[PDB]
Paper text:
Many of the mutations found in these variants are localised to the viral spike protein, which binds to the host cell receptor angiotensin converting enzyme-2 (ACE2) enabling viral infection. Here we use in vitro evolution to seek mutations in SARS-CoV-2 receptor binding domain (RBD) that would substantially increase binding to ACE2. We find a double mutation, S477N and Q498H, that increases affinity of RBD for ACE2 by 6.5-fold. Binding of RBD to HuACE2 involves three key regions of ACE2, the alpha helix between residues 19 and 42, residues 82 and 83 and residues 353 to 357.
The complex was imaged by Cryo-EM to produce a good quality 3.2Å map for which we could build an atomic model for the complex and observe the new interactions across the binding interface. The dominant variant recovered had the double mutations S477N and Q498H and was designated S477N/Q498H-RBD. These mutations are located at each end of the binding interface with ACE2. Examination of the structure reveals mutation of RBD Q498 for histidine results in a perpendicular Y-shaped π-interaction between ACE2 Y41 and RBD H498. In addition, RBD H498 now lies within hydrogen bonding distance of a flexible ACE2 lysine residue (K353) which would strengthen the interaction in this area. A neighbouring aspartate side chain (ACE2 D38) could also mediate a hydrogen bond via a water molecule to RBD H498 and this is supported by a continuous density between ACE2 D38 and RBD H498 at lower contour levels. On the other side of the interface between ACE2 and RBD the gain of a carbon atom from the RBD S477N mutation places this side chain in hydrogen bonding distance of ACE2 S19, whereas S477 in the un-mutated RBD is unable to reach S19. In S477N/Q498H-RBD, N477 and H498 are positioned at each end of the RBD binding interface and work together to stabilize the RBD:ACE2 complex, once formed, as indicated by the more than 4-fold decrease in Koff observed for the combined mutant. In our experiments WH-RBD binds Hu-ACE2 with a KD of 9.3nM, whereas S477N/Q498H-RBD bound Hu-ACE2 with a KD of 1.4nM, representing around 6.5-fold higher affinity of binding than WH-RBD. H498 and Y501 are in close proximity and the local arrangement required to accommodate the phenolic group of Y501 will be constrained by the imidazole of H498, reducing the advantageous π-π stacking between Y501 and Y41 in B.1.351 as well as perturbing the H498-Y41 interactions. Thus, the negative epistasis between Y501 and H498 results from this conflict of their side chain ring structures.
Author numbering:
A (entry chain A): 19 to 615
B (entry chain B): 338 to 358, 364 to 386, 394 to 515
Amino acid sequence: STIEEQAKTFLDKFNHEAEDLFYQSSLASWNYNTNITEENVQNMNNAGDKWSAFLKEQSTLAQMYPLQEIQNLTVKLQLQALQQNGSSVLSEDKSKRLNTILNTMSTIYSTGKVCNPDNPQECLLLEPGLNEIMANSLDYNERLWAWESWRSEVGKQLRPLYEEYVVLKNEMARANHYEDYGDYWRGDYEVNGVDGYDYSRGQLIEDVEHTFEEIKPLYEHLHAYVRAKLMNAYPSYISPIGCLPAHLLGDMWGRFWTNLYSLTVPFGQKPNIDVTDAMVDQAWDAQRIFKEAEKFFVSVGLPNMTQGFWENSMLTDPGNVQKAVCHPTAWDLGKGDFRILMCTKVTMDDFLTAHHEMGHIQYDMAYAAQPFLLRNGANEGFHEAVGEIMSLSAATPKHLKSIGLLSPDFQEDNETEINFLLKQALTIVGTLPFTYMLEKWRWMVFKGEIPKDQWMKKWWEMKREIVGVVEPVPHDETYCDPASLFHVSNDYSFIRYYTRTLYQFQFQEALCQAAKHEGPLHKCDISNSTEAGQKLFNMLRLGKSEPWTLALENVVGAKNMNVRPLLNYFEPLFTWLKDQNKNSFVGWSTDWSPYAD
Amino acid sequence: FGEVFNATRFASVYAWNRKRIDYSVLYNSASFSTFKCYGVSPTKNVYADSFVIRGDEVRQIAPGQTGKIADYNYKLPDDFTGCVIAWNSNNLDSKVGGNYNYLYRLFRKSNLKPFERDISTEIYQAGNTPCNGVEGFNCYFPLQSYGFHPTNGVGYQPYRVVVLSF
Ligand SMILES: *[C@@H]1O[C@H](CO)[C@@H](O)[C@H](O)[C@H]1NC(C)=O
Ligand SMILES: *[C@@H]1O[C@H](CO)[C@@H](O)[C@H](O)[C@H]1NC(C)=O
Ligand SMILES: *[C@@H]1O[C@H](CO)[C@@H](O)[C@H](O)[C@H]1NC(C)=O
C-alpha cells in the first residue's frame, strides 16, 4: 500500500491500456498514408484525438504520485515521462494564442512563394521552385535574387510572430520549472540519480563548444578548398581572404554543401562508384533489395525480419490505382508490428536507404521488449546514427563486390577514395558549423543575451565568425533570417544532428575495432562480424531505460561524445587538403562584404 | 478429444474451461506449435483445461514459471504430470478491427493456488481508501481484454492452449 506499489500498479494499468490505443492510431495513420481517402483522414484524426485525450488524462492521473517517495529508477523514469504536462501548464487563452501562432508560422512557411515583378501572375513556390535554382543554377544574379526575395518575404512575415512565439515559449518553460525554452530543449540529455553517469544541461553547451573547437581546423581547410574552387567558378565575386557568399553554398540556407561537388570535384575524369546500371542489368527488384539488406543484417548477427514485415509493407509504388505519399519511413505500429513504407526503385541511393530503414526497424525490434514508455532511443540522436552506420557499412566497395554488384577486377584507386571522402566531407563536415551556430543563436535568444533589436546583427556576426559565410545584401531589424528555415519556424530542436554525427562516427569506429578491421576507417565493413553485432544489440536492447551515457560506454567505452573518430574518418582527406592548401590562405577575415568590401 | 481440440470457440484464460474425459494420432498431427509433456511422454480421470492466451505467454504455462498468467490466471504445480498443447489460431480468434472477447485478470491481492479458478470481478483496492465499488484513484477493474488483431506479431497472436492432467 506504499507509494512505490501504488505507482507500480498505476504503471501496470497504463502499459496495458496504452497498447491498442496507440495501435489503432498507428493502423489508421498507416491506412491514410497507404490509401489517401477522406474517410481514412477522418479515421486517423479520430484515433489521434482519442489517443491524445487518453494521454492527457493519464498525465493528470499520474501527477498525483510524488517522485520523492520513489526508489526505483525505471518507475521514476516512466513517471517523469508521463507526468510531463508541457504546454498545458499555461492558461487556456495562452494555449490558444500559442497554438494559433505556431499554426500561422507553419502555414506562412508552407504557402510562402516569392514572385518576380515582371510576371506576378506566374511565380515559383519553395519546392521545387527556388530549391532547383539554388541547387542547379550557376548564375550569381539569379541566386542572389532568389535568396534576397525569399528572405524579404518570409522573414518579414515571420518576425513579429517569432517574437511572440519566443515570449510565449519562455513563459511556458518558466511555468514548467525551467530557466528558458533552450533549457527545456537541453533537458532531453539530462541524466540524474545515477552514480558516475550524471549529465547536466549546462554540460551540453560546454561539450558542444569543445567538440566544435576540436573540429574547426578540418572545416577551415575544407572552407579554403571550397573557396578556391568557387573563385575558379566565380571570377570577380569571391575574395581569396574573405568569407563565402550565402547564396553560392549549393542549397538555400547553406546547410549542406553536397551540390557544390560538381564545382569542387578533385578528379572529374574519375567517376563515382554508381551501381544502378549493374542493378538494372541483373534484374533487381525492390523485394530483392530488401532481401539483400535482410541478408546483410543477418550476417552481422541481428535476427531476420518477421513474416508480417514481408506481407504488410509497401516496398513498391502502387501507382495511380491508389495514391500514397512514400517518404521512406520505418513504422513501429505496436504489438510486434513493424513495417517499411517507401517507393523503392532500382538505384544505389534506394539500396542505402533500404539499409537505413532496415536498421531503424532492427533497433525498434531490439527495444520492443521494454515497457511502453521506455521504447525510444536512449537520447534523441541514436536512431539516425544507427541508420547511418548501416548505410556506411552497405556503401563500401567490399560489400558491393561481395554481394555480386561490382566487377571483381575493379581497382580501388586512391583518387576514387579522395573523391568519396570529399563528398562525405561536403555532406557531413559542412553542416556541423551551421548546426552549432543555429543552436547557439536560438539558445542565447531564448536566454535573453540577444535583445530583440540585435537579432539580425548577432545572427550575421555568428555567420561571419563561426560559419565563415557573409551575407550578400545588407539586412535590418525587420528581417528574421532563421525563421526562413523549416525547423526554426516549425518549433524543432537542431542539436540532434550534431550529436547524431558524433555518435555515428564513434559507433562506426567502435564496431570496426570489434570487427578486427585493419586500414582506413572509411574502407571498413562490419559484415560477417558477429562480435560487432553482439555489442550493437547489447546497446539496442536497453531502449531508453538506461542513461545514454551508459549505452555509449557499452559501445565505445566512453561516457561522453568524442570527435576523434570523426577526425580519424577524414584523415586521408585532411592530409590531401593540407597538401593542396599549401599556397592558399587558410581562414577568413570577418570584415569583407560583397557590398562594403 | 473431439470438441476438446475442435470446439467452435474457446473460453477466456481466467474462466478456463475444464472437461472430464490413443495419444498417438494427436501427437502426429504435425500442426501444434507446442506439445510439451511433463513427466509422462505422449507415447507412454483426465482433465482437459482449454483457454486462449497470447503467443508470448505460452511459456508461462510451464511449471515453475512467473508472470501474470501464472500468478493470477492459471497456475500449475511444480509436480505437474500432464501435457500442455498450444497452437496458433490467428485465423479463428482474430478479426479486422480487433477481437475483444477474450479476457484475463491483471490485478490480484495474492497468487492463485494450483488448479484454482477465479471469476469474481471485485474492484481492486490498490490504495488505502476503500473503492466502494466505484472505479477511481487507486481503484482498477481487475479484468482486461486481449486486443487480438490479424496484423499482430507472432508474439501477440492468439494461441489456443489445452492442458491434459492425469
Ligand atoms: C482505399 O480506400 C477506398 C475507399 O476508402 C476503397 O474503396 C479501396 O478499396 C481502398 N484500397 C484498398 C487497397 O483497400
Ligand atoms: C524496479 O522494478 C523492476 C520490476 O518492475 C525490478 O526488476 C527492479 O529490480 C527494480 N529496481 C529496484 C532498484 O528496486
Ligand atoms: C560472409 O560469409 C559468406 C559465407 O561464407 C560469404 O558468401 C560472404 O562473401 C561473406 N561476406 C564478406 C563481406 O566477407
